[PDB]
Design a binder for this molecule. Structure first.
Ligand code: HEM
Length: 152
């Protein structure tokens, strides 16, 4: 649950992402894959990537980064009223991709890391607080659907 002022911070930060969605999406996935190499094994189309240089050179990884952040941005713009947008993603990630909630924690922290890396000194403590709360809400509502499905 976020206040109006917190949502305003989230959507202000998101403007930074929308200026370069592919570059942000690429770096988020690279941070996930290099920090948590077990996550790469869930992607049949990226498991061939052995080095970060190959990851950086992969145009399909940048494409998928655009898909991921476009979906997340659509959810964030609903300011919590995201049941219709979130349900299909919860279902596909639990039942088809088999993504444990832990990996959603990993990618949430990766987003925070990338924002500081690309905007050092321009991602203030209030903005980090609000973005963190928004990603916690996203993860918590996914977790509720995971529990319904019995997925661990
Ligand atoms: C912010 C969190 C995430 C968002 C918004 C997101 C979004 C998406 C979307 C929109 C798709 C394509 C449609 C679909 O299959 O539902 C997708 C596919 C997929 N996601 Fe995610 N995802 C997220 C996190 C993760 C994480 C953490 C993992 C694994 C560590 C993951 C694994 C996958 C896989 C394996 C696919 C299929 C890729 C393919 O072969 O095309 N997702 N995701």
């Amino acid at each position: 649950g976020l206040s109006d002022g917190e949502w305003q911070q989230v959507l202000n930060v998101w403007g930074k992402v929308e200026a370069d969605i592919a570059g942000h999406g690429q770096e988020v996935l690279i941070r996930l894959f290099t920090g948590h190499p077990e996550t790469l094994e869930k992607f049949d189309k990226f498991k061939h990537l052995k080095t970060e240089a190959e990851m950086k050179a992969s145009e399909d990884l940048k494409k998928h980064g655009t898909v991921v952040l476009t979906a997340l941005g659509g959810i964030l713009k609903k300011k919590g009223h995201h049941e219709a947008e979130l349900k299909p993603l919860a279902q596909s990630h639990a039942t088809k991709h088999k993504i444990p909630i832990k990996y959603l924690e990993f990618i949430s922290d990766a987003i925070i890391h990338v924002l500081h890396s690309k905007h050092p000194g321009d991602f203030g403590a209030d903005a980090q607080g609000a973005m963190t709360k928004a990603l916690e809400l996203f993860r918590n509502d996914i977790a509720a659907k995971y529990k319904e499905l019995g997925f661990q």
